[PDB]
Symmetry: C3
Subunit: 239 residues, 3 copies
C-alpha cells in the first residue's frame, strides 16, 4: 500500500484545461503529491522542453494529504476522463490503499472512474498578454519551423524567416501587449515552433505571460493558475 | 398506382432531427402511412436493435391520408434532403399516383425534391433525464464496448469495466436525473455501447427518457415527440 | 525596381473574406494596381470561369499609388497571411522598390509579413438574395453535377436532375428572394455545380446578387463590395 488522499477541485472543466494545456507535448508525467500541493513534472519525448505544473493546496476546496508520494497514470486515459468534466462540476481525486486513482465528477450525477497508477542566468524578461504571443507563434508557423526572440532596451521582437517568406512582430511598452520588459543586455535566441505552438494554444488577453530568455539559451515561459498555481515551460534553444 | 397523400409538418429542422435521431443505426426503413399517423419501423443490419418511430396525425398542421400504405425510400438520400430544412420552415410530404415522394421545404423559397419510392416481462422501469443517460453512455465508452445497467429498490447503477479502467454512475430519487424508479426485483443486464451511443446522441435535460429492462433481457428505451409521438428502441442484451 | 505603394483597408478579416470568396476556384491571380483602385483577375485551371474583383480607391482609408503595375503573389501564402487578420484590425499593403509585398496587420500589435512578388448579349437578368441562391445550389448538388437556370416572364426556376432524384426551386416577385426579373425572352442554360458552389459559398440575406444569363451561354454573377467594389464571375455553360 501507498499513502491515501482526497483532493477536491471546484470547476472540473477548468482543471481538464490545465491538464490538457500542460500535457500537449508529453506522453507521461509524474505527479508529486505533498501536504503543500501537487506538482506535475514531465519532459516531451525529444527532451527539448521541461514542464512543471504546480497546484498548491489553496486552489482546492478540500485537500486531505497525510504524507508524500510520486504517482504516474496513463496520460491519454487521464485527459479522456477529465474531458468528461462539465463547466461548474466538482472534481474529486481520491486514492485508497490500492494502486488506483478514483476520479469523480459531481454534477447532474456522480460519475466515478477508476484508473490504475504507477537557475539559468537569464538576460531578458518580458511580461506579455497571452493573445499577442499566441498570434506571433501562429504567424511565425506560416513561414518557418523556427522563431527568433529579440529583446532590446524597451523593445521585444519576434521574427521568423523561411525559404521565401518572412514575419516580424515588434512591441514596446506603448503597445497594449507589453506589460513589462526588463533587459540586462541585447538578447537573441531561436526556438522550435512545434514546441511553442503547444505552449501557447488556448492563451488569451486574461493571461499575463512571463517569458525569460538569454543569448543562445533556454526560454522559461510562465503563467499563473488562479494567482497561486503555476505552469512553467523550460524550452531548449534551436541548434 | 399507390394511394396519394399530403402531410405538412411545421418545423422542418426539428423533423430532420427526429429522422436523423431515429435512423443513426439503420440503412433502410419502412414507413406505414395510415389515417392515424406515420410509423417508421427498422432494424439495424446486425438485428440487435428494433426502431419504432410513431408520429400521430395530431403533430402535423395538415394530414390528408384517404387510405393505407407501406413505403420505403433510400434513407441516405432522405436524411440529405431533410438536412436542407431550416429552423422555422414548413415541411411538405406529398405523394401522387406515381411511386415518388415529393418533399417541399417552404421558407425564403419553396424547394421541392423528388425521391423514388419502394410484450416483454420487464422487471425494472427508470425515468431519467436525457443528459444524464447520454453522459453515462459516453463515460462507459471510454473503458469498454459493453455497459451494465443495474436497478435496485430506489437505486439505478450504470457500470462498465475494461482491461484496465472502470466507470460507475449511481442514481437515487434524491438525484435530479432520476424522475422515477419502479422495480419488481433486482435487475441486471449488459448492452453494446455502439448501439447505446446512437440511441442517446442529441439528448438533453428537456428529454424525459423511460428505460425498461429485465434480467439478461432486452432494453426498451423510449422518449416522446411533442407529447404525442414516440421513439422506441428495443435493444438485445449483450452475450 | 517597380512602382511603390501604400494601401490601407479598415477591417482585415472582411478583406481576407473578399480574397477567400474571390479565390476559391483559382490558384494564381494578377493584381492590377492603378490610381483608381485594385483589380484582381483570374481564371480557374479548367478555363470555365473568369473572376474579376474590383476594389476602388474609395473603400480604402489610405490609397497612395503614384503609377500603375500588374503584380502576382503565391495565392496560398496570401490567403494564409490574410486569414491572420482579426475583425476590427487595420490591413496595410505596402510595396517598396524591391519585388516584395509587405502585409501588416495592426491590432493588439503590428504583425508584418513579407511576400515575394511576380459584352455578352444576355437575355435574362435576376436580382436574388444571396441566401436563396446558396440554398438552391446546395439543393441541386444533392442530385446532380449540373444545374439548369430558367427565366420566364416574372418567374425564375432552378432545377437539377440526377440518375434517380430531382430538385426544383421556383421564384416570382411575390417571393422575398426575388428583387428583380428583367426578361427579353424565355431563357434556359445549364452550369457546373462545383463552380457554382464556390461562387455562392458565404452568401447571405444582406447580399443582393445579380445573375445575368442567356440561352446556352455564360452566366455573369455579380455582387457588390461596400456599394463601390464588385466581384464578378463569368461562368461558361455546361456542354
Amino acid at each position: 500500500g501507498s499513502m491515501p488522499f482526497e483532493i477536491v477541485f471546484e470547476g472540473a472543466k477548468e482543471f481538464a484545461q490545465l491538464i490538457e494545456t500542460a500535457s500537449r507535448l508529453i506522453d507521461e508525467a509524474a505527479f508529486k503529491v505533498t501536504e503543500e500541493g501537487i506538482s506535475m513534472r514531465a519532459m516531451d519525448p525529444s527532451r527539448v522542453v521541461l514542464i512543471d505544473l504546480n497546484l498548491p493546496a489553496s486552489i482546492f476546496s478540500k485537500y486531505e494529504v497525510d504524507g508524500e508520494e510520486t504517482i504516474g497514470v496513463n496520460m491519454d486515459h487521464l485527459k479522456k476522463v477529465l474531458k468528461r468534466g462539465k463547466a461548474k462540476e466538482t472534481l474529486i481525486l481520491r486514492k485508497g490503499e490500492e494502486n488506483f486513482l478514483e476520479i469523480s465528477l459531481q454534477g447532474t450525477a456522480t460519475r466515478t472512474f477508476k484508473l490504475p497508477l504507477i537557475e539559468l542566468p537569464f538576460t531578458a524578461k518580458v511580461v506579455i498578454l497571452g493573445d499577442v504571443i499566441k498570434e506571433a507563434v501562429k504567424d511565425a508557423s506560416l513561414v518557418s519551423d523556427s522563431m527568433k526572440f529579440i529583446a532590446k532596451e524597451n523593445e521585444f521582437t519576434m521574427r521568423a524567416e523561411g525559404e521565401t517568406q518572412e514575419v516580424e512582430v515588434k512591441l514596446t511598452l506603448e503597445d497594449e501587449g507589453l506589460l513589462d520588459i526588463e533587459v540586462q543586455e541585447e538578447t537573441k535566441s531561436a526556438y522550435g515552433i512545434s514546441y511553442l505552438s503547444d505552449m501557447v494554444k488556448g492563451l488569451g488577453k486574461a493571461d499575463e505571460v512571463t517569458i525569460k530568455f538569454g543569448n543562445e539559451m533556454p526560454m522559461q515561459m510562465e503563467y499563473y493558475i488562479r494567482d497561486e498555481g503555476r505552469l512553467i515551460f523550460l524550452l531548449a534553444p534551436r541548434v
